[PDB]
């Protein structure tokens, strides 16, 4: 009669590494690394992302005409640019502190787009119908939906002053532009005053702008330029615009709501009616395991990105069947 | 392995022991078979479960220095977490295999300590009794209630 002590073996082919030995076959192991994605853009907490498509953040917020389908979207779980996000500033120029503006939008989960200065009541004694072929739409010259090109009327551009008081209970993003014509003749044809100025002031913002006339290498058929500026008007505060030329005035502004856990990613993936807790630019990934090697850029409740190709912990025994 | 049992003095595992991680094979006049040690298997499952749960818990063209600092931060954190993840898994895998080895060794020594010189120790994990050990006797060995005085006289006669 005999009794023997022994241990379990099976047909597992799982392998793990240790410090003393590589590729040990074991009876049971656990993968610790998410290493697949579903190739889709998905909702977070039931909320879809804002897909800018062929537009970038500048084209969206200025209202580049080619971005009209974006205008009514009011809330999103993250912002998606494409490699094709080309429609931005259609009249060439510099977007001042653009990267800071993107950083601000990265924590915005919704906003209200509203008329800060109605077109036909805010700027008496000026023309408000300026368009340009650089911002075309339907093969016709057009302009930013959220700004307004003020020009002389009846050979005169009187000094203007207008103000807006923020009674939204939320920060208001205000954008405007300054036109820099290529030569003095265009300056006088558009704004009459050669030594024009613009002033924009809040309680905690102030800047003066001048025509800065200069002939530039042409971009999109324009020797002149338009610079773009923004500020965040805090609740209760007033913004004041003063000008005798060159102002590309605000028309629509944005009352901002802040949220946690948003961001901006660039992705070639398509939206589907899927749901995830963790989105990457390649696709959605699961969130149960501690690590992932799909992509360093993630949105949501996500595993930690690592470079590892394999992370596998043994739970069972060294497997020695026979 | 560190404790000498798995892939050691017990050279291989048992595909026939399907119902646990460590246990017994017996042969007597009533027959033969495998039986897991359920207490040691459950205790090991508890420990490995706790271990697994423990493990599973833009810049513009004139801002290149800031861009490179941001990249240094991202790359350095990634280096550190890749290192931490891989090293913890290697270390814990070594410890898990040694834990199983220890569990087998301890079960073997518990049987050896019950049987004393009422059985001959072959050296491959097996004991050959110096007395007839029927199914109730085998179960007493597996359950830690083996009665050495009951069989000592028969065994001493056979050990001679």
């Amino acid at each position: 009669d005999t009794i023997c002590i022994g241990y379990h073996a099976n047909n597992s082919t799982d392998t793990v590494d240790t410090v003393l030995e590589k590729n040990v076959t074991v009876t049971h192991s656990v993968n610790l690394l998410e290493d697949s994605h579903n190739g889709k853009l998905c909702r977070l907490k039931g909320i879809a992302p804002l897909q800018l498509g062929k537009c970038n953040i500048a084209g969206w917020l200025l209202g580049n005409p080619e971005c009209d389908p974006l205008l009514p979207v009011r809330s999103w779980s993250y912002i998606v640019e494409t490699p094709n996000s080309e429609n931005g500033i259609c009249y060439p120029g510099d977007f001042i502190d653009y990267e800071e503006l993107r950083e601000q939008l990265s924590s915005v989960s919704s906003f209200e787009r509203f008329e800060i200065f109605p077109k036909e009541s805010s700027w008496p004694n000026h023309n408000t119908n300026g368009v340009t072929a650089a911002c075309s739409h339907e093969g016709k010259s057009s302009f930013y939906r959220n700004l307004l090109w003020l020009t002389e009327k009846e050979g005169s551009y009187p000094k203007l002053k207008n103000s807006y008081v923020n009674k939204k209970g939320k920060e208001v993003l205000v954008l405007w532009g300054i036109h820099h014509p290529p030569n003095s003749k265009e300056q006088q044809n558009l704004y009459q005053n050669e030594n024009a100025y613009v002033s924009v002031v809040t309680s905690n913002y102030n800047r003066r702008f001048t025509p800065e006339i200069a002939e530039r290498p042409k971009v999109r058929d324009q020797a002149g330029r338009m610079n773009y500026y923004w500020t965040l008007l805090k609740p209760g505060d007033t913004i004041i615009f003063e000008a005798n030329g060159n102002l590309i005035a605000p028309m629509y502004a944005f009352a901002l709501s802040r949220g946690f856990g948003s961001g901006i990613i660039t992705s070639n993936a398509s939206m589907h009616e899927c749901n995830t807790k963790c989105q990457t630019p390649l696709g959605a990934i699961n969130s149960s395991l501690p690590y992932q090697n799909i992509h360093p850029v993630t949105i949501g409740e996500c595993p930690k990105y690592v470079r590892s190709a394999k992370l596998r912990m043994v739970t069972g025994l060294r497997n020695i069947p026979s | 392995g560190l404790f000498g049992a798995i892939a050691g003095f017990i050279e291989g595992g048992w595909t026939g022991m399907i119902d646990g991680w460590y246990g017994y094979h017996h042969q007597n006049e009533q027959g033969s078979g495998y039986a897991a040690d359920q207490k040691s298997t459950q205790n090991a499952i508890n420990g490995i479960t706790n271990k697994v749960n423990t493990v599973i818990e833009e810049f513009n063209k004139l801002e290149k220095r800031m861009e490179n600092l941001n990249k240094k931060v991202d790359d350095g954190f990634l280096d550190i977490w890749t290192y931490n993840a891989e090293l913890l898994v290697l270390l814990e895998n070594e410890r898990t295999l040694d834990f199983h080895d220890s569990n087998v060794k301890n079960l073997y020594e518990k049987v050896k300590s019950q049987l004393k010189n009422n059985a001959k120790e072959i050296g491959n994990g097996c004991f050959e009794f110096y007395h007839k050990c029927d199914n109730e006797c085998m179960e007493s060995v597996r359950n830690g209630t083996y009665d050495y005085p009951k069989y000592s006289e028969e065994s001493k006669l056979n050990r001679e």
Partner: peptide, 15 residues
């Protein structure tokens, strides 16, 4: 059918 293994660190144990 033998053990409490809520994480499934062991197999089915034949049952």
């Amino acid at each position: 059918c033998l053990y409490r293994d809520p994480l499934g660190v062991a197999g089915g144990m034949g049952c």
